[PDB]
Amino acid sequence: FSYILVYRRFLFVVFTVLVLLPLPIVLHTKEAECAYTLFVVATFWLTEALPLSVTALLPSLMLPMFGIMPSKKVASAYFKDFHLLLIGVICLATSIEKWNLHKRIALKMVMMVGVNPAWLTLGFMSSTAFLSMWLSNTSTAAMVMPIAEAVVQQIINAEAKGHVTRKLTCLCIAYSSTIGGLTTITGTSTNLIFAEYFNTRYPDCRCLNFGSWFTFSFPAALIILLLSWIWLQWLFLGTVQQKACAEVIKQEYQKLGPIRYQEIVTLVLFIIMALLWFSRDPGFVPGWSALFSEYPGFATDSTVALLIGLLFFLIPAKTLFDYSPLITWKEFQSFMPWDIAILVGGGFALADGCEESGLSKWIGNKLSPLGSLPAWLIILISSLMVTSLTEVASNPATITLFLPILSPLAEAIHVNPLYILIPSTLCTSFAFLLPVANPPNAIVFSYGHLKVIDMVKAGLGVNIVGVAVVMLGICTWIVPMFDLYTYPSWAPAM
């Protein structure tokens, strides 16, 4: 009977594949065939019977076999615009670890803030969420991660518990970067789609702008961040030695030497890449996106990462009778996480197979017959629906689905069409459970410290915190701003 115990994750794979086969065979519709794929692929990284990148190739195997989408179309989703930003930023992250730009930022910050385990997991949440309201969510988690990984590395190495304090700064960065993106419109991509859709569906309204979006979400994002900091720190880890452990940090700073030539070039290109992401289209000032304002939406944040990320292959670093560049590409293929680029692309082919089948439209059509309900319960069914569907799909894919559904739903029962749209837009970007749903969650699995069950157990509590603040906010301190109780005049009559 002991042979079952050692092969417990091989018999499990052939079980759930065969026992769920009555679902797409008895039922013949393509919604029941995409639901079989969404039940098999999703439970293969929850229980983790297989590695995470093998199950991401399973969308590209049974979606052509069921007749949902061809093999040419399911293969064009494993490399999207996320991977051009992902490639061009780990050409920067490679050339700061080789020339050791970190350990000169981590051995300078630790001897300025002190070796405190409790007040350094708040400086990584309050500075990330301030940096995230100007940049994107992906480009913020890609910069502050190789520096804050070196900070927790040096404090552990200055001991002359370590496995559980590395899961904090991985999770406090993936969560604070998406929490700080709720504050402004141009802070994330989900808030920009809602701003474009509301200004054309309801013209002559004129309320949503910079500053008006801030003062109803900045009190909402500050309570979530201060409650996530208590919840994340308690779940993982709830001066005769301090004087000795503060001298190892100073002594390791002396053997570095002066700052060389090859660290200033990476420090300069760390700034120009950050001063071009911020100055692209900041909304309240025109930027260099108004120079290309004849082919709009062509040059994105991924061409900025490739413009400076490919300059590390050119700049000379050390003479040899050739020269040597900064990154040389031989130690780039060993530094690039090639398992994340398949795992993220596997979640993109599943969000494109649900749209082609109709399973995303099937769930959204069940929300429209809820007209015989109170005005607060129709939010509560809708707000937990978008948080569930955003764990398998991307955030710009869920908001374009539900905005043409909730807009005729917010006109038949004479309710204001911002009392439903606002608590469904903020809860769209509450992707905390799976790393296939959020690109800030995928620059956190590229370090090998967290498991999948450590994100589900620690991200399920942040969703209850995140929903209960917006549900509190939709009744207090937002209803005097946009007047969410009376039916407005920029809406249809009947």
Candidates 235, 191, 198, 197; CA nearest to 214 is 191
Residue 482 beta carbon to a copy of itself: minimum distance, rounded to whole angstroms? 23
- Window 275-314: contact mask with a copy of itself (x via CB under 8 A): -----------------x-xx-xxxx-xx--xx--x--xx
The dihedral of CA 291, 297, 301, 305: what is its sign? negative
Q: What are phi and psi of 392, to 5 degrees?
A: -115, -25
Residue 54 beta carbon to a copy of itself: minimum distance, rounded to whole angstroms? 5
Candidates 332, 324, 328, 334; CA nearest to 261 is 324
What's at 39, amino acid-wise? F
- Indicate whether 137 belongs to the interface with Na ion (CB under 5 A): yes
- Window 40-69: contact mask with a copy of itself (x via CB under 8 A): ----------xx-xx--xx-xx--xx-x-x
Contact partner at residue 109 from Na ion, a copy of itself, none, CB < 5 to 8 Å by partner kind: none
- Indicate whether 138 belongs to the interface with Na ion (CB under 5 A): no
Encoded tokens for 165: 């304090």
Beta bridge partners of 318: 324
Using DSSP's 3-state secondary structure scheme, residue 324 falls into: strand
Contact partner at residue 181 from Na ion, a copy of itself, none, CB < 5 to 8 Å by partner kind: Na ion
Stretch that binds a copy of itself, among 76-84, 207-215, 216-224, 279-287 (CB under 8 A): 76-84
Encoded tokens for 331: 């130690």
Among 165, 189, 328, 407, binds a copy of itself (CB under 8 A): 328
| Region 219-258 residues binding Na ion, contact defined as CB under 5 A | none
CA–CA distance, 170 with 175 (Å, rounded to integer): 9
CA distances from 263 to 254, 269, 326 (A): 17, 10, 10
Stretch that binds a copy of itself, among 21-29, 71-79, 162-170, 452-460 (CB under 8 A): 71-79
Encoded tokens for 5: 């115990």
Q: What are phi and psi of 434, to 5 degrees?
A: -110, 145
- Indicate whether 187 belongs to the interface with Na ion (CB under 5 A): yes
What's at 169, amino acid-wise? T
Q: Which is nearer to Na ion, 181 or 345 (CB)?
A: 181
Among 95, 128, 132, 139, binds Na ion (CB under 5 A): 132
Using DSSP's 3-state secondary structure scheme, residue 316 falls into: strand
Backbone discontinuities in the chain, residue before each (C to N > 2.5 A): 160, 238, 320
- Indicate whether 336 belongs to the interface with a copy of itself (CB under 8 A): yes
Torsion, Cα of 329, 334, 337, 343 (10° steps): 110
Among 181, 345, 364, 459, binds Na ion (CB under 5 A): 181
Contact partner at residue 314 from Na ion, a copy of itself, none, CB < 5 to 8 Å by partner kind: a copy of itself
Q: Which is nearer to a copy of itself, 3 or 119 (CB)?
A: 3
Candidates 448, 471, 450; CA nearest to 459 is 450
- Indicate whether 188 belongs to the interface with Na ion (CB under 5 A): yes
The dihedral of CA 470, 473, 479, 485: what is its sign? positive
* Site for a copy of itself, rule CB under 8 A: 6-11, 13, 16, 50-51, 53-54, 57-58, 60-61, 64-65, 67, 69-72, 75-81, 83-84, 87, 292, 294-295, 297-300, 302-303, 306-307, 310, 313-314, 316, 319, 321-323, 328-329, 333, 336, 338-339, 345
* Site for Na ion, rule CB under 5 A: 132, 137, 181, 187-188
